């Protein structure tokens, strides 16, 4: 092995400017990091700058350095969609023709009609909403009628809420399984169906930890699958295990925040493993990008950057750190959807004594997957070109 451990960090939604095909998606002008930097009157990310973020692209407060710690370039998404699954699945060596859909105006009547026909239940709601908002509005009617509250987020999900005393958990799970079957259809391709049971009285409803998720497996065996099958460790941190529906995962560490994500990364640095530690920092996307909150997004990026020196200190000569993103989600852009953007790529090992250089632009996110596979001597993915030898 060239490297014994690879630490892969997806800064979720942290895009570095509109991709060549951004027009198709209505994403002309999109620039996640750049617009955040302008909002902040300069972003304070000195550690990402030291790695060479500014060498990829100069933005307000983010300048190039003469000697970046590691190698740098950006990646272009090759798959059709810009959704949560597509980006991650491509990173791990796939190509995804069929995008997952989002539903800013709610689900098509055809889909909801079939769900009603199959379940014998009425559906109410059918809108994007937080768990709290939707229960405040509809919790009581749901309790009184035995209907189903169906709602969505800004991502590709169909959520079904029902009071635990009115709809038994096992019946709610059965319904979600029906909904999962109906949404494997490119007319309304849903990434994840989520059971959202709740308890309480009107004006005091709370969602319970009896949530169950119904996700799709990646459309192909991934580099994670190949690592696991070759007896390597694959440690998933945050939503990673969920994103891949556990495929190729040997250990999964739940996280509650970006700072907690960095704590778990540090935990894995302290573990003797051989293979991949794979972190998703999701706050950027979930709390700030979708909510179009550039101030909060900027603060989160500064908080993340300040955690990096400890990571640098713990990396060994045979460790490789890869930092990237999965799509954009520009907090100063119309609507609530992701933006089609290039993503940054930083590749650092303390064994890089002369520092790094610019890499050729990665024509698919799958170049990460290919690099990981080549490093560990496992079957190469169908897509992606390794940059291992460039490091």
Binding positions for Mn ion, rule: CB under 5 A: 12-13, 26-27, 84, 155, 285, 326
Nearest approach, Cβ of 239 to Mn ion (angstroms)?
9
**At closest approach, how far in Å is the CB of 254 from Mn ion?**
18
User: Nearest 5°: CA angle at 241, between 132 and 182?
Assistant: 65
Rounded to whole angstroms, how far apart are CA atoms 148 and 193?
Answer: 14
CB of residue 189 to Mn ion, shortest distance in Å: 15
163 a known binding residue? Answer: no
Q: Annotated binding residue at 39?
A: no
Residue 326 counted as an annotated binding residue: yes
Which uninterrupted H or E stretch holds 281? Answer: strand 275-281
Instruction: Give the pair of three-digit tokens for residue 9.
Output: 């960090």
List beta partners, residue 308: none
HSE-up (13 A, CA, CB side) for residue 305: 19
- Nearest residue (CB) to Mn ion, 84 versus 226: 84
Under 8 Å between Cβ of 190 and 154: no
Taking the complex as a whole, how short is the minimal distance between the CB of residue 122 and Mn ion, in angstroms? Answer: 30
Cβ-Cβ contacts under 8 Å for 363 (sequence gap 6 or more): 76, 78, 385
Instruction: Tokens for 201, please give them.
Output: 């009285």
* Shortest separation between residue 365's beta carbon and Mn ion, angstroms: 11
* Residue 327 is assigned to a ligand binding site: yes
- Which distant-in-sequence residues (6+ apart) come within 8 Å of 168 by Cβ? none
Q: Is 330 annotated as a binding residue?
A: no
Q: How far is the CB of 22 from Mn ion (least distance, A)?
A: 8
What is the C-alpha separation between 33 and 221, in angstroms, rounded? 32
Nearer to Mn ion, 16 or 69 (CB): 16
Q: Do strands 157-163 and 148-152 pair parallel, antiparallel, or not at all (unpaired)?
A: antiparallel
Across the strands, what pairs with 341?
18
Please check if 35 is assigned to a binding site: no
Binding annotation for Mn(2+):
12, 285, 290, 326-327, 338
Binding annotation:
12, 285, 290, 326-327, 338
């Amino acid at each position: 092995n060239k490297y014994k451990r690879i630490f892969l960090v997806v800064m979720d939604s942290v895009g570095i400017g509109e991709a060549p095909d951004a027009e198709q998606f209505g994403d002309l002008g999109s620039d996640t990091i750049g617009h955040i930097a302008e909002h902040m009157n300069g972003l304070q990310m000195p550690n990402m700058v030291k790695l060479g973020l500014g060498n990829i692209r100069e933005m307000k407060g983010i300048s190039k350095v003469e000697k970046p710690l590691g190698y740098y370039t950006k990646m272009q998404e090759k798959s059709t969609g810009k959704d949560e699954m597509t980006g991650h699945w491509e990173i791990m060596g796939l190509y995804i023709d069929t995008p997952f859909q989002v539903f800013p105006e709610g689900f098509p009547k055809e889909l909801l009609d079939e769900l009603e026909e199959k379940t014998g239940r009425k559906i109410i709601g059918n809108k994007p909403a937080s768990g709290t908002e939707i229960l405040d509005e509809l919790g009581q009617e749901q309790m009184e009628t035995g209907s189903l509250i169906v709602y969505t987020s800004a991502d590709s999900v169909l959520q079904i809420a029902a009071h635990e005393e009115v709809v038994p958990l096992d019946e709610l799970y059965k319904i979600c399984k029906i909904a999962r079957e109906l949404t494997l259809d490119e007319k309304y391709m849903v990434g994840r169906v989520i059971a959202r049971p709740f308890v309480g009285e009107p004006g005091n409803f709370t969602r319970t930890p009896n949530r169950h998720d119904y996700a799709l497996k990646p459309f192909g065996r991934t580099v994670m699958n190949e690592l696991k099958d070759s007896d390597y460790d694959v440690i998933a941190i945050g939503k990673i295990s969920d994103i891949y529906d556990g495929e190729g995962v040997t250990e999964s560490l739940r996280t509650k925040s970006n700072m907690d994500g960095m704590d778990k990364l540090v935990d894995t640095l302290n573990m003797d493993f051989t293979g991949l530690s794979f972190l998703n920092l999701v706050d950027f996307d979930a709390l700030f990008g979708h909510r179009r909150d550039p101030q909060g997004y900027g603060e989160a990026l500064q908080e993340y950057d300040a955690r990096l020196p400890e990571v640098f200190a713990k990396l060994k000569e045979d460790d490789l750190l890869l930092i990237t993103a999965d799509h954009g989600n520009d907090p100063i852009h119309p609507g609530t959807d992701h933006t089609r953007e290039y993503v940054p790529l930083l590749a650092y090992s303390p064994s890089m004594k002369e520092g790094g250089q610019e890499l050729p632009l990665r024509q698919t996110f799958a170049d990460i997957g290919a690099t990981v596979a080549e490093n560990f001597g496992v079957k190469m993915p169908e897509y992606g070109t390794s940059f291992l030898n460039e490091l």
